[PDB]
Amino acid sequence: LSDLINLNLSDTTEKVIAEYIWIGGSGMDLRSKARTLPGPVSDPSKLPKWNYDGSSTGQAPGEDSEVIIYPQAIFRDPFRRGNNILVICDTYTPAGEPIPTNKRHDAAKVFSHPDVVAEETWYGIEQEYTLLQKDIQWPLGWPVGGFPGPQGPYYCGVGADKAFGRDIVDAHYKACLYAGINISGINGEVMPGQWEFQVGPSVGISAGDEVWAARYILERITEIAGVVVSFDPKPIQGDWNGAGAHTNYSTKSMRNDGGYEVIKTAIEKLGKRHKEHIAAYGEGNERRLTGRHETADINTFLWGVANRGASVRVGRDTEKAGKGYFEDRRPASNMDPYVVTSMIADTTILWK
Amino acid sequence: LSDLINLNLSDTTEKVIAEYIWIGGSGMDLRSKARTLPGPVSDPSKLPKWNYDGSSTGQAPGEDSEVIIYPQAIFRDPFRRGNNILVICDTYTPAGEPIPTNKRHDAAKVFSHPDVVAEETWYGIEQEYTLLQKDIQWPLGWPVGGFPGPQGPYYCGVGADKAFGRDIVDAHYKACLYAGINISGINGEVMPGQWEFQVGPSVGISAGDEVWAARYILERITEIAGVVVSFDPKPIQGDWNGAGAHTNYSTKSMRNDGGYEVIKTAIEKLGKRHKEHIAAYGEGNERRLTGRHETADINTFLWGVANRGASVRVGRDTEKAGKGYFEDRRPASNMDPYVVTSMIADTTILWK
Amino acid sequence: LSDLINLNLSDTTEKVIAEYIWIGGSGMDLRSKARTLPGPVSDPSKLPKWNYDGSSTGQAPGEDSEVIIYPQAIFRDPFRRGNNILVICDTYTPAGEPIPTNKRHDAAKVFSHPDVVAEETWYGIEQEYTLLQKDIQWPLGWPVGGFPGPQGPYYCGVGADKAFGRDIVDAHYKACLYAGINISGINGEVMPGQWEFQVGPSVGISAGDEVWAARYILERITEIAGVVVSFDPKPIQGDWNGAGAHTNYSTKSMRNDGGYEVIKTAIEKLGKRHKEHIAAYGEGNERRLTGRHETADINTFLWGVANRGASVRVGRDTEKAGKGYFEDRRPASNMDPYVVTSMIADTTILWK
Amino acid sequence: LSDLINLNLSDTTEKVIAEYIWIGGSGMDLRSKARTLPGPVSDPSKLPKWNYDGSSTGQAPGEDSEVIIYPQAIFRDPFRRGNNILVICDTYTPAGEPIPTNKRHDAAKVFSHPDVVAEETWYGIEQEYTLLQKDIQWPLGWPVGGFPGPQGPYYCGVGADKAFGRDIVDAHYKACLYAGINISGINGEVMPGQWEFQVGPSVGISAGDEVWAARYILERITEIAGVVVSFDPKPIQGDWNGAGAHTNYSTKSMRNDGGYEVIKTAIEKLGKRHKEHIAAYGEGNERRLTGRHETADINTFLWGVANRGASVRVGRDTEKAGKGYFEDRRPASNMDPYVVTSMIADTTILWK
Amino acid sequence: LSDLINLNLSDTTEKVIAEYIWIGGSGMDLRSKARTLPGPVSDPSKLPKWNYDGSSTGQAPGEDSEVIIYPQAIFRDPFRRGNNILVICDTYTPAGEPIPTNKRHDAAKVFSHPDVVAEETWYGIEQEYTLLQKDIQWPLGWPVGGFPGPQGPYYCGVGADKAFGRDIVDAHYKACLYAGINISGINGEVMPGQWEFQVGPSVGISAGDEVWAARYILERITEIAGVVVSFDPKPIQGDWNGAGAHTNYSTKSMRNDGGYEVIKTAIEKLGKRHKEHIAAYGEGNERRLTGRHETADINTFLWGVANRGASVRVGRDTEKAGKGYFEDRRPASNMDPYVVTSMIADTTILWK
């Protein structure tokens, strides 16, 4: 079936294949479908819109199930290659308003303000995932109906005993680099069969545009290998760690001289908003964040510099030179990056 | 056996391989066989006619079973590549008349009229299919003697849990783009293991040819993988949807200013012919069309703009701008594109 | 999943993938993780440092688990190709001191002296490994719950009966040559499924780098083949021989006329320090070194010219010409090249 | 192994093996082991007291892990047969006070009250369970990673595709009838692989004993079949009915003419105690009792004559004849029969 | 094969097969063969002697490999049944002196001392063993290259996933009860696949004999199941409890009223002999006895009333009533019962 999937269409025609991708009803799964266009295009403004049956996804009533999707971001296709592209789309109503599942409209509204634009907000998102076997929700390298050895050799270890699913991870890393996602590294986590990828400094809404892209690519890659991928914080319970997502924030004021006071003020503003942020960081965070294995408490807001378990973590270089980034470690691995980045920018700058 | 199937003959010889393809006795299955020609040919007029045994297919008596096949359409071969071609042929009688299974003669006669030629009728065909396991007529991704999970995630799903047979679909999409079929996109449908492909705006009789070509190509790609493909309107019964085929009609007068009145008149003329069209859209359509959750019914004719369950569906933008096209949703997935295109053209224009 | 792992990124971007590699808590296992850099880099001085969680490895307390890793050596990447690199790193403390597991600091301190720099010392390290089946601890090619034939045909055997896991060995040899490790040959040892590779003459701390590189590569290669690799001296007990590592030492004075007296003086200095060297060559080397068939013994120090069962072995051409190297055969196969090379250089030259 | 498990020791010796069974720390798991006795015995008061280690079960601290075992009931041994017996036992501290997980002490105190003794109380317990595959915890007859057909054919089914695990049910029914349990019927429930059994009319505390023996037998029989039994109320989520256990209750005053008034008064007495009863009758019952199909809800208490959603139901025959029992449908499959029976007796007979 | 193994020879002939069992060179393994005898016999002194090849076992030099076999105890054959018997034997040199591996001679001399004979010593033995898979030496019910769940559910478990290999335990229990062994209980230990059995109160040397016979039966039963028995103290390293045996000891003076003073004097006498006792009670016991969970240590001798970590424990009953036995928890599962019983008798009754 190869020699047909990997067939170069630029030798015989100029038509391109576009991949319209949107978010399903639950707010965590991705839906996509392809089309053909007369020629190459790289500006999202001049791409046609679509519609789809919202009843089949859970985002529209029965009588008028037409749901409109608008192209928003363009990346290079790492599966079809050539001149084909992936389109990260946003979903509206035929009247013209976003559906309640749509969250990029609010994010674009927040990031479009002159203040946030002048602040040059930069976000870096670290995301876990767990590779499970297909039919039984049992992670890779775990024997069927059997636990693996105790933790300790699975964190960045090399060998057939410790690295489970490294082919998928290397393929995902090269595919995300090829497509255009600003990926900044990979590593293996303490749980066996659990890995991590980081989307590096990316400005504004573009951040949320590409991390959502990476997930899509990752899932599709696993579809080739017959493996399930879970971003759920707690796929396995017991003495095994959870999966979470970390956010690195860097405004222009922080990177300049005297930015430590800016960081302190931003963290103080983030404080007293702990409950709303926790309630908007994604379902399942209750089980992941309980204090085990140096994890931040759900009901307490404390920030440190050297402690691994804290709400907000500030590095040594930032404490020394008084400038840099700061890291929030509360968001769960099944979050919505649009929401998290939006309200972080809201609390830091817009809020008074 | 590779390195021999994928062997380039253009480095050693000028001879080409042609694939004569025709429709079998049942009117739904395809038959084909290959031959060798001295050099490249691109015009269907200068291709030699061929013959076959009608008794082995079910289209001729015992005494004189020879059936003549006339080359009609030429496409590029996506399996042999090089300068080889696929020939979409038509079946006649040695005396000179079409056999009762032949339907392209009537369509060509209708489309050859000056009125239909001057009106630039364009058709678009949406075709459903289902991927079943080989020995047991049981769809892909369904456990043997076991139903899959409830519907809802399989419509455009991405993970390994949702997309079944995606490699065949991508191969078919690229192969049809390579050959020359004006394919316009693909997607996955609500039933697991069920997919869709659109043949885009194509003018006149060529439309029909293209559709059949695509089907042939799919029928071959599946047999590389070891999967059965069914266009039957209802392969699996219960709370599972059925495969279907949609048609999009657009004449020149509809495409111009004041075309909404033309669309209304055409739909009015299509009405009162409901029973004949229903009886001429494909066996098994009774089991698919049942009024399930506001969908088309066999015994009732309805048309609307947002109610997608009507017999005739007209888009919102087409109504508000007047110009555009319209869509008929009654034809079954085992139809004959010649017949439906001919009937639509005759009712809209030729009929008084 | 190929066509994505083996995807050339130099055709679309300038960014490189770097592989930071360090030594885990036990002093014998290797941990690694990757990142992306804006462009190509070849000097280790101008590479950024990292940090990692020492708690997950066993090299830091609970409260402040951050362990800093400094790039030290650069090699080409034999798995990613292109402009990607492997970085052999060294572990420190955020205060600035090496952790007790760090051994390259001492080695660099010893090799940075003017005396050792002026007197060029070259080291060659022979390393033996065993290939075992994955889930069981049973060596490759042995039957499950059964022993192979008696020894004698497995030393450099050619047929399918004697060469077990040769594909891994050939791949490792080619990959180590490609990356830049100064490899100098391979062979198969007397035990079936056991092999050996030589890292050739390389000067100073560089040796301790590239050996640790080769091991990493080897282990990663086994991940592709689903095989476990063991450098443990005695993976199998009975009448089956053990795995060891040998060190060829040659300073500048030994390479010149009258160097036999230098070799004799160096061996005299190395003697009477048997206990410390043995205790620093590994823990549990008594199992491999017993004295069977006149081999080396732990409690006794001996040196000869042809007695293979001696602590120090001197080749025939060396006393024939009075110049050359000498071979120490005490270190175990799970040694630390930093420590061994440091002790040999310190005893030979620095000590009085 | 067999012909030794089925070995008649009465031909050779007069000693008898006694099997002691107690309830573990979780309050719903059963532990048991074996003892050798000089001769046959039928009186539980003639059986010696005994002990076990509470640390290994979760019932005592490390300093005092000794937990004493008091024989309370005797049945026949169905697996060893002959003169060997099963003993149902109670758990006590070395000092003489029952441990917190002990619940038969309070029930025996309640059932020894002169009013309860003279009222001749009769219970019948309807207990449902689910059979699961050993490794993957997927119900019996369910394809791995799939679902069976919709509900409706499995209730009291007879075919090979409708009754899944009737061998285990037949073996358990015969074994409980041979041991001495009053088991009064079995059938297959609506879900595949789910069954129930009825422990018939047993007076007072004895009822709670028999059920705690019946469960034991079931478990061991599943151990012979390599299947896992589950008394969890809702093992599978979706449109699949759960497993809840009910209790029919009657008293001598209810067996007399005009007892419908007494049944009514007991019904109001059991009412307005819904909170404590639901709290003490099993956790995890919220998933089972939701309100679907007009059934019982946790937050609402309902009693009627024909409504199948009633928390407490009274049959037509009770109204007609004027006397009988009434059925409590509140508890789940994972109850403790002791607390249920004792609470019903308290809230009906003695508590004012 | 069967229906011939279970063949009754009493219907046809009067000859009886006698099975001779002895202890091999390693001091732990058992060897055995079969002999044909003219008729039934029940007295060990009426049985002929054997001789066997000590070279093939590891007990005699090549020039004199003849080792004489002395019958000592007689039990019934559980595998051949009928009138066939098992014989426990003693090993001797041709001249007449015992071989070094013989240990029953010294215990027989000790137990024939008039004071020991008059004291009528009573012993009980607690033997714990582990069942392993045949080829890979991984415990029963453990996934290959994996681990089961944490400890806690397996102690005296009943389910299919908690008790592993209970068929072997049942067969062994009934076979030992039919043979004539005083076996007084079985249960499942905390580790999966690990069990124990208690050899009950047997007077003097006879105790040890029975234990050996018991071991023999166990091994042969495992041979039927294709499983490997292991009496090694610590087969699996990690957070898994080992297999250590125990010995309860009583004397007529201890059973007499006011015997707690005698028990205390015996405990004091057994104290300060810890070095010799630990040396002679099994090697490889260092791994089992470390000090975890406040247990016994090799370098610490402790005796108490309730501390479960005591080397010699005394129950509450022997303090309340003042009469009873005491339990030595020092020896491992691979003891020789002869030497343990003999030294316990010596250091209490005759040694001053």
**Residue A147: DSSP 8-state:** B
Which chain A positions have a beta carbon within 8 Å of C36's beta carbon? 177, 183-185, 200
Between CA E9 and CA E96 the distance in angstroms is 37
Q: Is A173 on the interface with E (CB under 8 A)?
A: no
Report how far apart the first and last C-alpha atoms of chain A are (Å, whole number).
Answer: 60
**String of DSSP letters for A211-258:** HHHHHHHHHHHHHHHTEEEE--S-SS-SS----BEEEEEE-HHHHSTT
Closest CA to C304 of C295, B112, E237: C295
Angle between helices E337-345 and E104-111 (to 10 degrees): 30
Interface chains of chain D (3 or more CB pairs under 8 Å): A, B, E
| Two structure tokens written together for D295 | 């059934």
Helix (H) or strand (E) holding E173, with range, is helix E166-179
| Two structure tokens written together for C26 | 């036990």
Q: Closest residue of D to A144, CA-based? A: D135
Between CA E20 and CA E77 the distance in angstroms is 11
Between CA C95 and CA C103 the distance in angstroms is 17
| Unique residue bearing structure tokens 């010995």 | E247
Cα distances (Å, whole numbers) of residue B181 to B207, B215, B220: 9, 11, 16
Between CA E21 and CA E23 the distance in angstroms is 7
Q: What experimental approach yielded this model?
A: cryo-EM
Contact D196, D295 (CB under 8 A): no
Between CA A148 and CA E145 the distance in angstroms is 8
Between CA A175 and CA B297 the distance in angstroms is 47
Q: Do chains B and E touch (3 or more CB pairs under 8 A)?
A: no
Name residues whose C-beta falls within 8 Å of residue D264's C-beta, 6 or more positions apart in sequence: none
Q: What is the CA radius of gyration of chain E?
A: 21
Torsion of CA C173, C179, C184, C185, to 10 degrees: 0
Q: Which long-range contacts (CB under 8 A, 24 or more apart) does D11-17 make?
A: D12/E76, D12/E178, D13/E177, D13/E178, D14/D38, D14/D39, D15/D39, D15/E177, D16/D40, D16/D41, D16/D82, D16/D83, D16/D84, D16/D85, D17/D77, D17/D80, D17/D84, D17/E173, D17/E177
Q: What is the CA radius of gyration of chain D?
A: 21
Cα distances (Å, whole numbers) of residue D121 to B110, D253, D352: 90, 9, 18
Closest CA to D80 of D167, D175, D218: D175
Name residues whose C-beta falls within 8 Å of residue A265's C-beta, 6 or more positions apart in sequence: none
**Residue A5: DSSP 8-state:** T
Other residues' Cβ atoms within 10 Å of the Cβ of residue A261: 11
**Contact state of A222 with B159 under an 8 Å Cβ cutoff:** yes
Residue-level length of chain A? 352
Between CA A28 and CA D322 the distance in angstroms is 59
**Residue A350: DSSP 8-state:** I
- Tell me the β-bridge partners of B128: B196
Which chain A positions have a beta carbon within 8 Å of B210's beta carbon? none
Between CA A287 and CA B167 the distance in angstroms is 37
Helix (H) or strand (E) holding C214, with range, is helix C205-225
**Contact state of D145 with B143 under an 8 Å Cβ cutoff:** yes
**Contact state of E149 with A144 under an 8 Å Cβ cutoff:** no
Compute the nearest-CA separation of B6 from chain A (Å): 9
Q: Closest residue of E to C133, CA-based? A: E145
Contact E222, E231 (CB under 8 A): no
The amino acid occupying position C68 is I
Strands B312-313 and B303-304 turn out to be parallel
Cα distances (Å, whole numbers) of residue E250 to A12, C56, E270, E317: 97, 52, 13, 14
Strands E66-76 and E50-53 turn out to be antiparallel
Between CA E226 and CA E135 the distance in angstroms is 10
Between CA A29 and CA A139 the distance in angstroms is 20
Angle between helices E206-225 and E104-111 (to 10 degrees): 140
Between CA D339 and CA D207 the distance in angstroms is 11
Name residues whose C-beta falls within 8 Å of residue D348's C-beta, 6 or more positions apart in sequence: D249, D251, D266, D269, D270
Closest CA to D225 of C340, B33, E161, C139: E161
Give ∠ CA D311-D317-D320 in degrees, rounded to 5: 115
**Contact state of C219 with A186 under an 8 Å Cβ cutoff:** no
Between CA A283 and CA A335 the distance in angstroms is 8
Between CA A30 and CA A215 the distance in angstroms is 9
Between CA A119 and CA A262 the distance in angstroms is 12
Cα distances (Å, whole numbers) of residue A251 to A269, A272, A335, D35: 15, 21, 22, 75
Q: Do chains C and E touch (3 or more CB pairs under 8 A)?
A: yes
Between CA E203 and CA D283 the distance in angstroms is 53
CB interface of B with A, residues 284-323, below 8 Å: 293-294, 306-308, 316
Compute the nearest-CA separation of D232 from chain E (Å): 15
- Helical spans, DSSP H, in D133-238: 166-179, 205-225
Between CA B225 and CA A161 the distance in angstroms is 34
Cα distances (Å, whole numbers) of residue D11 to C56, E94, E113: 63, 41, 38
Closest CA to B129 of B165, B158, B156, B175: B165
| Two structure tokens written together for B186 | 């693909």
Cα distances (Å, whole numbers) of residue B335 to B47, B212, B232, E79: 28, 11, 9, 75
Which chain C positions have a beta carbon within 8 Å of E144's beta carbon? 135-136
Name residues whose C-beta falls within 8 Å of residue B151's C-beta, 6 or more positions apart in sequence: B190, B191, B192, B239, B240, B241
Contact E303, E313 (CB under 8 A): yes
Closest CA to B335 of B223, B220, B252, B215: B215
* CA dihedral sign of residues B281, B284, B290, B295: negative
Between CA D178 and CA D84 the distance in angstroms is 13
Distance of alpha carbon C310 from its chain centroid, rounded?
22
Burial class (CB within 10 angstroms; exposed 0-12, middle 13-18, buried 19+) of B128: buried
Between CA D283 and CA B67 the distance in angstroms is 76
A79, A142, A144, A174: which to substitute to probe chain C, counting the most C Cβ within 10 Å?
A174
Between CA A159 and CA C220 the distance in angstroms is 6
Torsion of CA B223, B226, B230, B231, to 10 degrees: -40
Number of C:E CB contacts under 8 A? 11
* CA dihedral sign of residues E131, E134, E140, E145: positive
Name residues whose C-beta falls within 8 Å of residue D45's C-beta, 6 or more positions apart in sequence: D71
Of A144, A146, A150, the CB nearest to E148: A146
Q: Is D226 on the interface with E (CB under 8 A)?
A: yes
Report how far apart the first and last C-alpha atoms of chain B are (Å, whole number).
Answer: 59
Supply φ then ψ for residue C76, to 5 degrees: -75, 150
Q: Is D167 helix (H, G, I), strand (E, B) or coil?
A: helix
Between CA B226 and CA B165 the distance in angstroms is 11
Closest CA to B126 of B292, B350, B325, B351: B325
Q: What is the CA radius of gyration of chain C?
A: 21
The amino acid occupying position A2 is S
**String of DSSP letters for A172-189:** HHHHHHHHT--EEEEEE-
| Unique residue bearing structure tokens 């012909």 | D3
SS3 content of chain B, % helix, strand, coil (to 5): 30, 25, 45
- Helical spans, DSSP H, in chain A: 104-111, 114-119, 166-179, 205-225, 252-255, 259-270, 274-279, 285-288, 316-321, 337-345
**Contact state of C36 with A170 under an 8 Å Cβ cutoff:** no
Of D143, D150, D238, the CB nearest to B145: D143
The amino acid occupying position C218 is L
Resolution of this entry, Å: 2.9
Strands A50-53 and A66-76 turn out to be antiparallel
Q: What is the CA radius of gyration of chain B?
A: 21
The breaks in chain D (C to N more than 2.5 Å) occur after none
Distance of alpha carbon D268 from its chain centroid, rounded?
26
Contact E137, C145 (CB under 8 A): no
Supply φ then ψ for residue D195, to 5 degrees: -135, 175
**Residue A332: DSSP 8-state:** B
Of A144, A148, A238, the CB nearest to E147: A148
Closest CA to E328 of E263, E283, E284: E263
| Two structure tokens written together for A255 | 């990177």
**Residue D150: DSSP 8-state:** P
Compute the nearest-CA separation of A218 from chain E (Å): 28
Between CA A43 and CA A71 the distance in angstroms is 10
Q: Is A126 helix (H, G, I), strand (E, B) or coil?
A: strand
Which chain D positions have a beta carbon within 8 Å of B150's beta carbon? 238-239
- Helical spans, DSSP H, in chain B: 104-111, 114-119, 166-179, 205-225, 252-255, 259-270, 274-279, 285-288, 316-321, 337-345
Closest CA to D57 of D32, D36, D89, D35: D32
Q: Is C134 on the interface with E (CB under 8 A)?
A: yes
Closest CA to C287 of C330, C231, C237, C239: C237
Contact D196, D185 (CB under 8 A): no
Q: How many helices (H) and strands (E) does chain A have?
A: 10, 13
Q: Is B145 on the interface with D (CB under 8 A)?
A: yes
- Tell me the β-bridge partners of D89: D71
Q: Is D144 on the interface with A (CB under 8 A)?
A: yes
**Residue D44: DSSP 8-state:** G
Supply φ then ψ for residue A75, to 5 degrees: -135, 165
Torsion of CA E309, E313, E318, E319, to 10 degrees: -60
Q: Is C281 helix (H, G, I), strand (E, B) or coil?
A: coil
Cα distances (Å, whole numbers) of residue B301 to B293, B307, B310, E33: 16, 13, 7, 93
Between CA D15 and CA D85 the distance in angstroms is 12
Name residues whose C-beta falls within 8 Å of residue B130's C-beta, 6 or more positions apart in sequence: B139, B191, B193, B194, B195, B229, B230, B231, B232, B235, B236, B243
Name residues whose C-beta falls within 8 Å of residue D195's C-beta, 6 or more positions apart in sequence: D128, D129, D130, D131, D165, D169, D186, D187, D188, D189
| Unique residue bearing structure tokens 């020789």 | E336
Angle between helices D166-179 and D205-225 (to 10 degrees): 140
* CA dihedral sign of residues E309, E315, E319, E320: positive
| Unique residue bearing structure tokens 């290659």 | A81
Between CA C204 and CA C207 the distance in angstroms is 6
**String of DSSP letters for B231-295:** --S-SS-SS----BEEEEEE-HHHHSTTHHHHHHHHHHHHTT-HHHHHHTS-TTHHHH-S-TTS-
Q: Closest residue of D to B147, CA-based? A: D147
Between CA D73 and CA D18 the distance in angstroms is 12
Between CA C55 and CA C119 the distance in angstroms is 41
